[PDB]
Ligand binder design. Sequence first.
Ligand SMILES: O=C(O)c1ccnc(C(=O)O)c1
Ligand code: NI
Length: 305
Amino acid sequence: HTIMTFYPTMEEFADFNTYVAYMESQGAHQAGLAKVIPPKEWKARQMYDDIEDILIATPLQQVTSGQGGVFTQYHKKKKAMRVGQYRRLANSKKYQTPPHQNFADLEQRYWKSHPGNPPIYGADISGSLFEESTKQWNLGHLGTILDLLEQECGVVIEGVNTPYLYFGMWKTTFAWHTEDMDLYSINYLHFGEPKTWYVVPPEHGQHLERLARELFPDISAFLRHKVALISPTVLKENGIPFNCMTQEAGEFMVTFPYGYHAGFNHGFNCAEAINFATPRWIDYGKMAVTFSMDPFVRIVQPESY
Ligand SMILES: O=C(O)c1ccnc(C(=O)O)c1
Ligand code: NI
């Protein structure tokens, strides 16, 4: 019902699989989204002072159209750029975060800004900014059963079982979606301005889907497509429960199966994300970017093959 925030100690932090099982035992999955604040001692990496030359092969210009909190988003591929150029562009007068009193103010401006000036999103960059020295909660090495996909079938899907980086700027958005194969996801905000998340509890996913079909007749399973934006007001107006949580630098966000989510970046930032699985996911996977469930059912549910 409500988004939980967890504050693990280092000892609690060590094993990812175990801690996610713990989060679920406390009901975290019910809201569709949980925040995890790492222990004070922990770092993803020592310094981020060597990233200006990182290549953004295909920055995406995000064009919105629509009215009254209901928008379609379209992505135009732009020419390659480096992170340094991208950062400068993000902080330029044309693209910078507008002045705001607080979050509520900024959120209202975000929703009121559509269609408006299309931002550029450095999304879907194959890569990681975690160091190998980081042995807890390293998005390249979570060690969940999702590793069976590569290990048993040799299947590599970038961004699903390998990490993606997202360099964002004001107003860049992720439209409503669930993850491929109804997998979990984890998102770590390395640095920069916040990222605001909206989530609809899994219990109410089907209601969101119905509302979406009504709101986007021409387009209508089109949500996993990541193209529909629906404002909080429109959700409230149609009686869809949702939660809103802002993620700040140094914080993790975990999304759970059947948890629809959407959001936006406040300003220049850098996030890293990957999907993962648990034994609980397998039956979602059975019902569900597609891949075979064979290795999972065979190895994790030998009883039930
Ligand atoms: O763009 C993002 O930050 C984001 C957030 C949540 N999910 C996705 C996704 O592609 O699954 C992307
Ligand atoms: Ni997602």
